[PDB]
Structure formats: structure tokens, C-alpha cells
Amino acid sequence: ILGKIWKPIKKLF
16 A cells, blocks of 8 residues: 555545
8 A cells, every 4th residue: 555646646636
């Protein structure tokens, strides 16, 4: 479980 760039990117998208 990483999401180093998906935790926030998933919010803007």
C-alpha cells in the first residue's frame, strides 16, 4: 500500500 502520488492525485481527479 503506497499511493505516494495517488492519495492526493485521486482527490484532484
